[model samples]
Target chain A: GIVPDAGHQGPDVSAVNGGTQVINIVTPNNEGISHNQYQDFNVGKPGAVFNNALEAGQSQLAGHLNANSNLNGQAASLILNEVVSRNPSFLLGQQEVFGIAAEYVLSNPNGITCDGCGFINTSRSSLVVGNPLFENGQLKGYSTLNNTNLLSLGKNGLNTTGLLDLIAPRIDSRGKITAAEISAFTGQNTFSQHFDILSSQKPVSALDSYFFGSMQSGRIRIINTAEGSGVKL
Target chain B: GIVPDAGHQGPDVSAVNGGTQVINIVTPNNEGISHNQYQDFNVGKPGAVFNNALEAGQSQLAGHLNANSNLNGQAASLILNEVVSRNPSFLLGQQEVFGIAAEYVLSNPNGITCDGCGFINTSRSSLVVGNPLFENGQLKGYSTLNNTNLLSLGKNGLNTTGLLDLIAPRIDSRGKITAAEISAFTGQNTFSQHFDILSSQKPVSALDSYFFGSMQSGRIRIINTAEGSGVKL
Candidate 1:
């Protein structure tokens, strides 16, 4: 058994609009622990390679290493894996979640404590806190809970060859996270909602200035609504 | 007469490979002076408008005011005007050189002293010191002379909505040159040759670093080889 069932739902997977594959995982015992357990998800296509083509004159999205490897040439094949836990989820150390996707999105609502947790072969990785909202089998936005949840990164922090995005109410990173572009957003909304607001291109917005403050390569952006909401290395 | 013929060639115009119209202007007296003479060249099509289309994803070359007007919706109809003078040319105050061309190129081996020189409705302007080189009746590059020539800009300095390029051995500017992108190159080569060197994408080049130092909009770039070869503002 994965864990002692706490009357909670198990993990399930679904396809969204035939474009994105959504995987929903729940902590059965309320407190999700991944110290000795190795979880793997088969979300990517068999023998899929990373497609890194330079669109227009701009280079491929900052951190992608191979421009000639990966899924189809388009960015339509996305994998979104979301996790839910009633209590705080802890990955003590030496835990691995393996998957192959052009971009991997992981969402947890009740906070996450990552210590020596690793994601293999994931190019663009994102970690956020909220419940995904779908409209007609298409991801539209997210519904964030009111509780102040954290996405803490311990030693042996996250690393990616492409882009890394972290969004939560409070992020306390105490490790070395390496990526081409590390973007951290500390607000009340999820990453999808924040991205929507950014793409709107509206004036008189608070998140506008902080959005592209660090769009350059090998740069880090940690934006906080309040002083206590953001933490960085 | 334009001036007392010094047994030198007069002004002539020709079509270059059916793409660019070449206008060759020679200072008949060897001293090109435009104090009270308003020289007008009719090289543009009668009803040709400016075609300011944005190619790729980049915006229209920074300073174009209109994106809907242009000639034939292509950059084919370029006009290349070359002026040759043995002695330094002077354009005194309140003088105009009117033309309707996608781009205007003026070359003088001796020098150019512009004090209120105006170009009307010209988008891209280039002022260099060299001889035009054409291969197969098409403009290929330039043959730059070894003489050290100066490009002096006086008050009411050059203004263009598009791009302004000045390439010479020495530059002494004392006017406000307003343009979207102002690139000044000081070396012993013509602008075309310099552009070719830049486009080659070679490593360990001295001019490479200075080429894109001021590519941003509303920025100015003055690159000098030796100490006394550059000037600004």
Candidate 2:
């Protein structure tokens, strides 16, 4: 019900009463937004447009978790921003953000891990029980860095998860389409609705078993601002 | 517990979550963001920032009236964005945008109606009757080009509010400190907040009569964007 001139601007944001979170409304375009950065949410198909039905269902679950947790508004807002923006936070030497791009968006660039931003660390002394292919399924065809095998099915898609269509945007440049490409597009758009941060890193319980293995069973530290006071601006 | 660093690139947002409205968060430091063109809300006096104890109560109420009401995560995240970002689907006209210059973290900036971003349009349209100041105590000071005020009440401190601060990373301008400044510094950091989108024309209302007297009423036509389906990329 409104008109916009020629200018680039983001949507309006409403800070919650607590100044912790913001609510933004996407102004409708007569034809729709003209420019946009390809977001992982738009993956799977040529633009996972308007999956309202599933969005409602998932948002409800997030809402329920919010009701019980005391995570401040600011903290929660950041997490939502990450999911919507399709960017993952990197934790130096601890974790890789590839999952955000790999396992999530259909644009799954060919990096070894999920979200295309991941690279398998060979410096570690021990190896976890998982697929070697989730490393980078499409890297084989292109002659480039880390001349390892392209992430193929079991190895690239976490050997057991059965997910292998993801490939880095740059590395996946190939002559023709592959089966993974078909699978990525065949699925419905609902799965691209939300991203869970908990699934990315080593779980507190699992960290003790993996990092220390039989030698030591120490806990892995996890830090998040969500545990603090809400909206402290 | 999360560290701040340049992270992943998320989604490209053209509008807010809602089609016509958008929201942003601001703290004692004015946690909200700055728009390249349109922006509502300013740093209010900490003491008087909220009408209640929680501080978000007032902000919530002000946000609800941003648009014609049906805007949120879907149409527009915050209400004001719908008014300006679009060609006028929300507001028929504007009231005033009062800028303030707060220092010492008080609520003085919460209620000024003069100068550059020095004040916030606190007085809602009045339900009473009046003449010079109008029915409500609303003020008339919108020219409509951009930032026209001589001063700017930027962000406040951590867990605080004020009337003479043009925050560092945002509006790097200083304001005049006076008796009113001291008074503003001595008010309540309550549970409500506000942001104003000054209009080229002002309309007389019952709320304006009760609170602020609108001096000059700008003359402008209402915006209508429904005719066009979208933008011409």
Candidate 3:
């Protein structure tokens, strides 16, 4: 027995393939509302730990902690590009990553080496776009799909209210996080700290379950949509 | 392997001794903020997937997805005398546990059966408490302890700007998570979840790095008190 660790699912997002229902749980968006006493959570948003051996880097996902900013989007861009540069299929952004240092690293990968490169973030929701790997506005193999958000915004005028809000968060069914009606719905608030730099890249796995969290509502009064439609918890 | 379940760290809080520092990585929080979204980045928060398990009617930390009331004080009653009756050192209540018909038959446990059964949330930063076979708020033995809005709420008052904020999440010295902060900060969150009923009771083992998380700035930043700390990219 040792601490548990999750592999980089950003890369695995491709493995999941398109056109399938996947269940993913995002981290708690430390909106700095409750534990606002201290300067920061001592643990890293996307930190590194050297466990007697150098392991799991070039593929760490830490920028996901921040909300209301490009911190996570930045890192995700790096991961998306890393995931399937060829397939390019991550339909979401920032709503998940709460801003860790890895966000910067993963989002805007350095171009010095040809190994990991090219990344961009268009519009707010469409955080990262335009791969730095390709000069100007061109991607090596994919299309320079940067204006998707802009075009969509121009045509829709921001009717994204009910789009992302779900029943799970409304009743506090699964977790106790920053809900939409309070923040996401029409801007009750704006948690802008979306990314952080790596204080250290040491991977520490021993302290997860005590502070950080996941969503598992044991058994709530759900409508059970999965049975025939969309299950409501 | 799959996620692990929960087990009492020890019958009594003191029995388990002091808590330890922990380092964790987890899915980032993705509570959207208008255009900005808190992406999980695949890394789960601390208490998401653990190697331990909690039984029906038994309490443990489960989830804290995207809301802002994970472990608010009201979530549980901090009655130390009652807890001492049950044998808990500092935990207040187990809010995230429910008895599912399917698993209820086999999930029965025997801690202290009494009117003062409570878990000790003693050490602010450790997983050293458990239900010592207690029940019905009877004399099972347990224990004590002790946020609001504000993108700008001073350490003294109410509110600030923006969405829910990320505060005092501890960051470790190595720059990532310290063996202690993990338990300290994440532990509190985990304890709160127990009252909120989103407890993450998984043993400290079953998880991987993906469950822990951290960021570079804002409330949860690691203070670089020294110029060149042991942290690195």
Candidate 4:
């Protein structure tokens, strides 16, 4: 058997429709380890190995999430997304993708020619809006969007921490996407390398599990979220 | 066609046997994402997806390591280790496994009944002594080990930072396995969820790249270091 070279997910965000729930594991290519580490456990097919793992453990994870939160649904379609290094947050700035209504706009990746592959090369920030959902293989509802490079602080230090703090509002979305609490949360210490260019891209890279609820019926809850790193392993 | 259900690796500290390098991607099962995520990119196989990525980027990663320091070796065999979450760090305590020397001790996971399967569900700390190497398919030397329940720090702080800090020293190696400066650098604050238990297991859970140099006929140097979330995807 060979590695799931074709199983490469995410040059950008990947999605699927028609499921009570879905799980997306996303990150960029330059992160290296996980982008390739996942192949080792792909059960031979390649692609979505980790997403599949969560999907496999969906019963258990969902059970746990249900136990821990008020999420009242099951897990479905497990998606995988891999991006580039530099401007890794390229995915959060889409107009209309998969099936969600969005308002965020982002620049693209450098040297990548793949769809969704535009997640690296530059240094900008973005965010999401709404508890975006998908149904019947199409996106549903609205997605919270980012208008500013929340990570790009208008200062002089211009280091990775400032860049990282940009995305903190979304990660610490315990408040409205634009609240004082979310703003103050400062995802500053989240980075392993406060100064590494690549490090800036990984804080939200692997091990991030987004346990978002479809939260249908057209209502947004303060709960539901994105990526496993959003919640677990 | 299915989860790499049996694709689990790691109950033991597998070795190089006969290569200039042998890369091992280690993680505990309860941290399900990587375990399952790995399979997807495995190219339909069940081993070393990350190593492959590095193998692909060895040219890049290697070039970087070589330029950054004096690392002159290249990677050889790639291995994957997936064990029960309870016995996650079991391999680090081996008196003699593979070829490296070790000095860590641990208790086995309750339900786990395998060799090197005693990393989780306890409280303690441990470290290693050498970079350890392999030659002609046989053990060459020693490796730093861990025996600390660094994951045991409890409370409302169920975050990823502490959990990741627990495994840092092992990934931040750069000297004769220790240094006053290195010791002061506890690999802390690398996690985003400074408090999510599941989040804790992650970050360092998946997408971790550890670049180690056999540095044969050895003497440790900053040029030859281990740990430090190597690289990511």
Model 3: per-residue Cα lDDT over A28-62, one tens digit each: 12221100011111111122211110122222222
Candidate 2, B80-183: lDDT as tens digits: 11012211111111222212112111111112222222223322221000001112322221121211111122232111112222111011112222111111
Tally clashing residue pairs in candidate 1: 11
| The TM-score obtained for chain B of candidate 2 when compared with the true chain B | 0.17
Which structure among the candidates has the greatest lDDT?
Answer: 1
TM-score of each: 0.33, 0.17, 0.18, 0.19
**Native-referenced DockQ of model 3:** 0.01
Compose the digit string of candidate 1's lDDT tens values, residues A1-233: 02222333333333323223322233212121111111332222211122223232221222222322122233323445455445455544221222224455556677666555444455666676555665654566664435366777765555556777776666666555655666666656533533442321111222211111111223344444432221221
The 10-residue segment of model 1 chain A with minimum total lDDT is: A29-38
State the DockQ, from 0 to 1, for candidate 1: 0.02
Error of 4 at A26 (Å): 33
The DockQ value obtained for model 2 is 0.01
Q: DockQ of candidates 1 onward, in order?
A: 0.02, 0.01, 0.01, 0.01
lDDT for B199 in candidate 3 is 28
i-RMS for every candidate (Å) is 15.8, 26.5, 17.5, 21.1
Best by TM-score: 1
Candidate structures ordered by TM-score, highest first: 1, 4, 3, 2
Candidate 3 regions exceeding 4 Å error are: A1-102, A105-188, A193-233, B1-79, B83-233
lDDT of 3 by residue, B28-113 (tens): 12211001011111111111111112221232344322221222211212211112222212111221211111100000011111
